[PDB]
Enzyme design. Structure first.
Site, PDB file in Angstrom:
ATOM      1  N   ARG C  52       0.815  -1.148   0.021  1.00 28.61           N
ATOM      2  CA  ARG C  52      -0.053  -0.065  -0.132  1.00 28.61           C
ATOM      3  C   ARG C  52       0.950   1.326  -0.092  1.00 28.61           C
ATOM      4  O   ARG C  52       1.779   1.319   0.775  1.00 28.61           O
ATOM      5  CB  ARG C  52      -1.075   0.068   1.231  1.00 28.61           C
ATOM      6  N   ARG C  99      -6.824  19.352   6.728  1.00 30.78           N
ATOM      7  CA  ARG C  99      -5.460  19.567   7.492  1.00 30.78           C
ATOM      8  C   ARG C  99      -5.147  21.048   8.081  1.00 30.78           C
ATOM      9  O   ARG C  99      -5.790  21.965   7.202  1.00 30.78           O
ATOM     10  CB  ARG C  99      -4.336  19.295   6.443  1.00 30.78           C
ATOM     11  N   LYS C 249     -12.907   3.113   0.923  1.00 29.69           N
ATOM     12  CA  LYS C 249     -12.747   3.192   2.157  1.00 29.69           C
ATOM     13  C   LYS C 249     -14.018   3.892   2.916  1.00 29.69           C
ATOM     14  O   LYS C 249     -14.414   5.146   2.556  1.00 29.69           O
ATOM     15  CB  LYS C 249     -11.562   3.937   2.376  1.00 29.69           C
ATOM     16  N   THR C 307      -5.824  -0.401   9.827  1.00 28.78           N
ATOM     17  CA  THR C 307      -5.304   0.785  10.924  1.00 28.78           C
ATOM     18  C   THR C 307      -5.327  -0.109  12.482  1.00 28.78           C
ATOM     19  O   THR C 307      -6.483  -0.353  12.879  1.00 28.78           O
ATOM     20  CB  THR C 307      -5.869   1.898  10.685  1.00 28.78           C
TER      21      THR C 307
HETATM   22  K   LIG Z   1      -5.123   8.732   3.102  1.00 28.25           K
HETATM   23 MG   LIG Z   2      -7.614   5.501   6.880  1.00 29.02          MG
END
Ligand SMILES: [K+]
Ligand SMILES: [Mg+2]
Ligand SMILES: [K+]
Ligand SMILES: [K+]
Ligand SMILES: [K+]
Ligand SMILES: [Mg+2]
Ligand SMILES: [Mg+2]
Ligand SMILES: [Mg+2]
Lengths: 510, 510, 510, 510
Positions: C52, C99, C249, C307
């Site tokens: 990844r 961000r 995702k 994760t």
């Molecule tokens: K990302």
């Molecule tokens: Mg993530």
């Protein structure tokens, strides 16, 4: 709710809010971060049910005052007997541990260990407070007997690992594999060795007798290897501590192999993953957990999932994703109690840890596939004709049909309430009792929400029951378990006396 | 008992003797062979629970005396209130039938019909007592309206069949397909047609009102087509016959299609296979039976399998192999009551038929796969929070664990006992009642063994209950259901009054 | 193996060694600690199946060389085509991230935030590099539109949290809840809010087109909210990247609510617990995981648990107890692939993490209760008459009876092998393919062990098949999956061409 | 189709038409009413699959011509090999029967027996043709050895019953219980006694050897008591009749107790309810039937429900309601074949009986709850790794998913097709075979629809298969089993030879 486990998973809903009640017991270890009376008050409100005292560190004076603070903080709420929550005290024994010596030097009490370097292990008490890069002491006398060349020695709960290169008569030259900072009196594990320390050591007899004197509710006996170890602990507690529940901690390979004889002797079990995960490969711990929880559910005995459930919450205010899933899964597996070790004992966020424990547990309960759980528990139950068992199964079956807010159970010894918890009903079990030890020990069982009736025994039995039942009704309305007009199950006797809870009643809430 | 239905079958054992109790109700039709008081006494001992009166044949005088004899033979046993068995009376209405005329000639009242020959059907009342090879009369006035060319006309319960070749304004020329001997006033069926007779005909209003006057317990309403037909019968019974249970007989295609609305209106159902097997193809009757029994079990309402279950036993003293399997299978399907029509009404072996009925039923009960039956009934039950329902499910669940000899239920209206029967427990349900109609109507439900407490109401409620419970204990010991030292379930109230049976109790037998 | 799930748990055995094959795919994120060709070689041997690349951080030059190293280390093993393991490359997009700005001051780029203090959030680009205790900038323009008073704003992946007190037109006054050290360009999450950034942002179009040019096998599209977001990504990949698999995702509340439409559009799913655990309460993440894995299993599409599965292994050489149980449970839940983020990207123990992943997964496979899993998957499957589906179910059913060491599947597009994996057989699926992308993309599916046949197409189809089947037989003997004399299932076509794998064969191993 | 058996029952629909195929085999007994070649032709079209010859009555000359007529009527259809239906011949042995003597007097050969009267039983051959009211002869020599005072003697298939009052050395004085008309050479049963006649008597050796000479397909061996009786019959058939299938008839108490050893030795079973219902109580026969059918399904061996299934259809053109339900239930129980004894042998409606058999069976198949049947059969199957078994289970599993119109099976010995039938698929099993005995014997198995390929063996194996597969496709289209464009399962080998049918193929219908 659904026809298959797979559709049950597919149906799980983040937006569907959970029931207000929380069935899974919470056990917090007390230490530096949680020892104060004002912190203990907040932990009780946050959801603490059992205070664990770890007798691998403190003196008897230290632990005596920890108990004193717990009862002060507990009895602080006793003015309101509706919102009073009993709180158990639990004595976790030292057991046959292997701890190192103290560290030499200024600044702090720590030293580095390089990967590939040499470290001599010694039994000479001249180095008892002079452990460093080169020399290391430890309290196990026969360490050279049970160890050979190539054996692993794990120090500080798995972090540091050593391979034995050479042997002496009473000294071992080793090579470091996993580096890191060594400290003072860290725990040592010898996977593959057969450590021959006593199960009830000389120190443990003092700690147990102290436990009886202090009037503790349960004992978490460490490193239980076989059924005879449980009977040794039973003897030391003796006549005076006969009612103290013994929870055998499974911490090692031998303990897993002998699980059935240990479970038979013990009142409950703790899947002590800490030492188990060093003694046995890390992959496998889950196999051992699921097995032990499974057999304990079938046996109808309390099982406790323990250690490292929210480890990151020692340092941080929120748990990791893996730590979230671990607590949920332990509850889904069928663990009666969840436990916090370092998280509450010496952490920067004790209260947030106890609240996460409460929060996850509370909607793991909702995600239990009760349809299958209850079906299978009936089949795997023996065909005994005890009237108390048959009433309990009747109550639980009845509770699934009239979606009950609770199952109220009048009980002296707790056994009537234990047998209801055995069949894992969705609703909470409001166990009404005048025996205050019964109220405290009931936290070990999933879904039992004990309430202590401090009132004197009213004259007529028929009206004495109605007082205790109406007392529970008031607690249930107070906590939000149910409201006026709802339906609940009630379990009583036929003329009082501990031994025959044989009467189920479907009562409207007044 | 076993993990799968297939292993359950494999485990069935001829040498394993059955339980002494017999849960399935037995309904016998009374007529020439069983009308006498001495024969009715023997049928009651052999196992009769409900006496059916067929109002397609007798006069009101005739049926009045049949009722009189039944109550004489019933009350014959009333001297012993332990061994007294209540016996219901049931009025089976004529309904919209199509019967032929009388036959002409000497010797006997019968004539032959060749295959392929011609037979003219007429509505002219000049041929009302002159039916023969050529001409045939029948009482249905609009027969030419609902019939077309190619339609089948079945005469004498399926034996003889005719195809319509031509039509007239009020006459039909037909061709014979199945031959045989025609008789006087034989039943006629019109499969494919939509017969527009009244559901409650003029004669039926007289028969129903008579039923109310005679104090019958139930009405088997014939040829029920839709929900409105049930409400018509409900109205005619009215205020005075409000407590008379209406059992809708499903005898035709229309009735099967509308089964759900009919079941909703009716108190119970009868799968009247006689007329159903002519109106619908013979293959298919089993489909209709299993469906109707299934839905009635799920709805919690009585269902009765009926007609031709032991037909050969009219002539012979032992049933055929198919007749043996039919009774067993109807009980295994989940039928509350089994019925005998000609077998007891006009047979050479009435008593042997009632005993076979008793014998087969009694170990069909044993071969029920209760593990699956009870699992599935819970899932398919609504999630209502009626306290009486939740107690009933608790009782039944409790009964499977402490292999109870019985479930004793104090009940005024029968409803507390009906709701226990709904979940099909293995043990018999001893329903104790002071209402004598409640005792008689309880035979409709599988496993309810009613007992009539003739005693006066004792002063204290707590002691009045104990009298009725101990009365049931004495009946259970007498019949062999259980013995001294065994365990049984007991269902009572909390202060008396019909509406709240909310107390389950697991009592040792004194 | 056992009759109930509860007995299945009770039967679990630490001493029972697992099968040599490991069905669950392993995905490692590449970064500083794992970017080198010699480290990538060791990760491939340790068990890496997919590399990844996180496109939130690197430049296109940086990622281009990471890809180059992966293929060098992969093709290093290509000399032996038996022991060659394909390795996929996966491009994880930036997506609509939020961000902060840069920090003001010397020494280092950090500032403290007290608990209870005030912090003004601004959109004014004058404070773009002047974030501090008082002022804070962030790149999301419409932050005042989607936020209200009382809304939480989480900064730096959950560590720091803020509650909105007041609002402005383009500024927000907030109060700090969780303290800690703020940094430069840290990620922000807005739980409750509906963030309206572009799903395919301007940067993401460049990264995707780059992905097509580099010949990546799959795209992990971040922050997918609805089905239209997936079609946007599909379009950007376009004709040239039509065969690139899109894995949506699920990182947020909106994505969970719309899960079904997203799953329909996507090729697979990733349960990205990282952002999901901030956006949604920490307790609940497990609910969302189990739901998404469940629905993906039923839909027959890849699902990836991701994760923080071994977070502690960034610092330490062994995982925590919770991290051990998380990986096992994700595999037991039915996750096709497990993922490592920081553990391999920037950790001190990348190889040990990949080995733990391999080790746990490999005997989570053994603890799967296949009896129930396969039963339920059949029931919940549609009744389609695709010949490839019916062969796959036949193969899987056949594999449970003749305890097969493998199911060998000749496949061009991977679809024949995907459909076998859909029914979760115990044995590994040796997917033989000449298409090298098919071999790489097959790692997404549980239990597919792809092997690349580099050989040229032999003349006769009947002998071309036998070469590919015997190639798989040699791989199976090499890896220990099976031995000479064992039985295996083989899936082939009837005359070649991608679209009809319709032939199952139970072959003895030569 | 549905989630529970109870909902499955509730879902059953009279208006839902059944599948055109009829899986359950039909066995008709040939006699006076069905012996003619023109009647046998109509019975074959009506649905006859096996012709049963009862060797308790005819001479060898008589039976030889019955066989001759059956083969004439069978081969009448051989001109069209698509619509040709094989027809088996079955030899039902006399076995150890007890028949009475002949009756004295003119007019007819019958005498009355009053209830309560006396009847002397004698073994003296002077009364061999002089049986009457007072004296009765019977061929069993040791009748006084096995009988005691109070023993029941049942004469004429249950109708007449006698209790033994006194004994002699070779004579028995009895009292009549059930009256009726005695006849010539009626069968006698001795329930409770242990009859010690030879299992293979002197007459039976002649009948079996004749069976081998006539080339019969199966033997229904009567009154099989134990496993050694089956081996005696196996020996007499010997080398030349090695391929003749032995079906053990369970007719008595001893046979039920020893069922497992008998089933192990036998090729199949017949639940001969006739004699069983006299030897064992009438209630109980169903227990024995369900047990034997259950165990035979689990063992994978043919089971036949037999005698009195449509008894009333000897006299009448339509069956009773109980007889309708009996046939359906036997098919639902899982009986491979249904049988007609008197209904076709000597009845007034042979053809209508065979059609009812066909009609009921054909939608009993539809009412089978296949979801549960197949689930349970897999669990209860051993875990053998025979490639033919694993292909069969794969085929059956595949057939449920792609709702197949058929499963086509190329087979020489029938075994490949038998193993598919063992798992009870919904679709019919078109067994293609060149062996004509294999085609005839395949009727014993539920759902095997044999077709005989008379064509010569084509050169290439690959094209020889395609001819037999396309032959089956043509039969399936002809019979309505499936149409052009549908999907079916096909089972073939890998190079021909009886022993390895290892290839499943999901083929579109051309
Ligand atoms: K990302
Ligand atoms: Mg993530
Ligand atoms: K300890
Ligand atoms: K009637
Ligand atoms: K015979
Ligand atoms: Mg520990
Ligand atoms: Mg009727
Ligand atoms: Mg027989």
């Amino acid at each position: 709710m659904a026809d298959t486990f797979l559709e049950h998973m597919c149906r799980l809903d983040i937006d569907s809010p959970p029931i207000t009640a929380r069935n899974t017991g919470i056990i917090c270890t007390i230490g530096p971060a949680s020892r104060s009376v004002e912190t203990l008050k907040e932990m009780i409100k946050s959801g603490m049910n059992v205070a664990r005292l770890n007798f691998s560190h403190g003196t008897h004076e230290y632990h005596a005052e920890t108990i004193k603070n717990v009862r002060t903080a507990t009895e602080s709420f006793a003015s309101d007997p509706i919102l009073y929550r009993p709180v158990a005290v639990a004595l976790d024994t030292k057991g046959p541990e292997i701890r190192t010596g103290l560290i030499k030097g200024s600044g702090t009490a720590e030293v580095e260990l390089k990967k590939g370097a040499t470290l001599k292990i010694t039994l000479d008490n001249a180095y008892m407070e002079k452990c460093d890069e080169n020399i290391l002491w430890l309290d196990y006398k026969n360490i050279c007997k049970v160890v050979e060349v190539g054996s692993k020695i794990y120090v500080d709960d798995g972090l540091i690992s050593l391979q034995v290169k050479q042997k002496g008569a009473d000294f071992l030259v080793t090579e470091v594999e996993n580096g890191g900072s060594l400290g003072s009196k860290k725990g040592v594990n010898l996977p593959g060795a057969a450590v021959d320390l006593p199960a009830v050591s000389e120190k443990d007899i003092q700690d147990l007798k102290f436990g009886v004197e202090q009037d503790v509710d349960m004992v978490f006996a460490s490193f239980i290897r076989k059924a005879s170890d449980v009977h040794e602990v039973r003897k030391v507690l003796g006549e005076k501590g006969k009612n103290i529940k013994i929870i055998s901690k499974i911490e090692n390979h031998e303990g897993v192999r002998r699980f059935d004889e240990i479970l038979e002797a013990s009142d409950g079990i703790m899947v002590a993953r800490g030492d188990l995960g060093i003694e046995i490969p890390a992959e496998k711990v889950f196999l051992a957990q699921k097995m032990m929880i499974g057999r304990c559910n079938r046996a109808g005995k309390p099982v406790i999932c323990a250690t490292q459930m929210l480890e990151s919450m020692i340092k941080k205010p929120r748990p990791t994703r893996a730590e979230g899933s671990d607590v949920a899964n332990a509850v889904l597996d069928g663990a009666d109690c969840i436990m916090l070790s370092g998280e509450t004992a010496k952490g920067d966020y004790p209260l947030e840890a106890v609240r996460m424990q409460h929060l996850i547990a509370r909607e793991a309960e909702a995600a239990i596939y009760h349809l299958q759980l209850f079906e299978e528990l009936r089949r795997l139950a023996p065909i005994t004709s005890d009237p108390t068992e048959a009433t309990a199964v009747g109550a639980v079956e009845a509770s699934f049909k009239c979606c009950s807010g609770a199952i109220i159970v009048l009980t002296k010894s707790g056994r009537s309430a234990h047998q209801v918890a055995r069949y894992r009903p969705r609703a909470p079990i409001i166990a009404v009792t005048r025996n205050p030890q019964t109220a405290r020990q009931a936290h070990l069982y999933r879904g039992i929400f004990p309430v202590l009736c401090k009132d004197p025994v009213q004259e007529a039995w028929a009206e004495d029951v109605d007082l205790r039942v109406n007392f529970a009704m008031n607690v249930g309305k107070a906590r939000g378990f149910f409201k006026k007009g709802d339906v609940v199950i009630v379990l009583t006797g036929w003329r009082p006396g501990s031994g025959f809870t044989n009467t189920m009643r479907v009562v409207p809430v007044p």
